């Protein structure tokens, strides 16, 4: 039940060829992570992956269909409709609450405010943060300003995830809540590709790609 | 030349009184520290002088003018039009260029756009940035987007900034980077007054207020 795929994709950065022609797929509920030395291509990969960046050659097909990365506002379009996104940094608004922050891509997208503050409300209180909802981002700590970010990335109902060291900067007790929080939302459904440093984690999850120099050099299968 | 002066503040957050009666005063140019124990209230303090949060009681005069925390949208105005803000975290807008980012509060306040991007072009090279400009955030490391975060402060020629941890989550390289670009901005005539959790930062500007259980207890000056 595949819901991504990469046809030799290739990436040219400065004149140099970051991505070298790498092919992988995703099956829907998949939790997929990538590992490798830094300078080996994952972010860029991850960036291509998950529509933000165009390819220098290749195809990526979402949910069976060719993505067109040619008209900015029509990627940005599909990206708000079926994929959400967590960073080592957080990316709130710091003016608006815990609540507003998560309802943004809502509201964006056209939905009711009502629907979408219950929406908000629930998303918050699943994650635990029922507590910070009027918070302001300068009040909460970096670890709960990430369960912020994670509610939004989950605002619109995404297809996949995309996590790009999401515990990067967290200490030991927030990185466990974390890892914690995305395999809850694996077993849930929700496929999720996730870059890090850290093969401890990449190791709780079911696949794993290993990159160097550009290219995809091994895959871990774990039942 | 009082740029800012508190008098007789405090602030009851959820029943306590955190902040227990403050009275200080900044002169134009100066560079403050803030430092004291967790739960001292210096983050409550520095958001109360910022124009963030109202006192429960106590006064605010900023450029000899008290401050009138009863309508929102006028406070914002002034905060706007008047002061920069540096936290711990960069809250960088994932989607834009790092130029982008810097002219989104000249662009809030009616700058012309011409204007507007000389101005985020001249701060981001002041700041070591003028090969990142079309860099999105997720591209930049936490140093490079503090150097962000700094510039868009500077944006509306702000007298006063503030800096709740501005180093936090940085390495010793740029976390001297950083409190360079402090002291170069307060050297150029810019009033700054920065919470720290790290006394050799404090040491390094011209007077530091010791907090201690909701009141300055102390009071160093440096010449
Ligand atoms: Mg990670
Ligand atoms: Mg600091």
Same mark, same amino acid.
């Given at each position: 039940? +595949?819901?991504?795929?990469?046809?030799?994709?290739?990436?040219?950065?400065?004149?140099?060829?970051?991505?070298?022609?790498?092919?992988?797929?995703?099956?829907?509920?998949?939790?997929?992570?990538?590992?490798?030395?830094?300078?080996?291509?994952?972010?860029?990969?991850?960036?291509?992956?998950?529509?933000?960046?165009?390819?220098?050659?290749?195809?990526?097909? $979402?949910?069976?269909?060719?993505?067109?990365? !040619?008209?900015?506002?029509?990627?940005?379009?599909?990206?708000?409709?079926?994929?959400?996104?967590?960073?080592?940094?957080?990316?709130?608004?710091?003016?608006?609450?815990?609540?507003?922050?998560?309802?943004?891509?809502? $509201?964006?997208?056209?939905?009711?405010?009502?629907?979408?503050?219950?929406?908000?409300?629930?998303?918050?209180? +699943?994650?635990?943060?029922?507590?910070? $909802?009027?918070?302001?981002?300068?009040?909460?700590?970096?670890?709960?300003?990430?369960?912020?970010?994670?509610?939004?990335?989950?605002?619109? +109902?995404?297809?996949?995830?995309?996590?790009?060291?999401? !515990?990067?900067?967290?200490?030991?007790?927030?990185?466990?809540?974390?890892?914690?929080?995305?395999?809850?939302?694996?077993?849930?459904? !929700?496929?999720?590709?996730?870059?890090?440093? +850290?093969?401890?984690?990449?190791? $709780?999850?079911?696949?794993?790609?290993?990159?160097?120099?550009?290219?995809?050099?091994?895959?871990?299968?774990?039942?």
């Amino acid at each position: 039940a +595949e819901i991504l795929r990469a046809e030799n994709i290739k990436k040219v950065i400065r004149g140099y060829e970051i991505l070298k022609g790498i092919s992988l797929s995703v099956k829907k509920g998949e939790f997929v992570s990538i590992i490798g030395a830094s300078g080996s291509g994952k972010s860029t990969l991850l960036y291509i992956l998950g529509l933000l960046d165009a390819p220098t050659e290749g195809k990526v097909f $979402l949910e069976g269909k060719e993505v067109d990365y !040619t008209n900015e506002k029509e990627l940005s379009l599909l990206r708000n409709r079926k994929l959400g996104f967590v960073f080592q940094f957080h990316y709130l608004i710091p003016e608006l609450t815990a609540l507003e922050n998560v309802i943004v891509p809502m $509201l964006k997208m056209g939905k009711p405010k009502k629907e979408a503050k219950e929406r908000g409300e629930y998303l918050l209180s +699943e994650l635990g943060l029922g507590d910070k $909802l009027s918070r302001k981002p300068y009040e909460l700590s970096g670890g709960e300003q990430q369960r912020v970010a994670i509610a939004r990335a989950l605002a619109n +109902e995404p297809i996949l995830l995309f996590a790009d060291e999401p !515990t990067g900067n967290l200490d030991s007790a927030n990185t466990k809540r974390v890892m914690d929080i995305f395999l809850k939302i694996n077993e849930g459904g !929700t496929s999720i590709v996730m870059v890090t440093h +850290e093969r401890e984690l990449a190791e $709780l999850t079911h696949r794993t790609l290993e990159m160097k120099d550009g290219k995809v050099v091994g895959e871990i299968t774990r039942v």
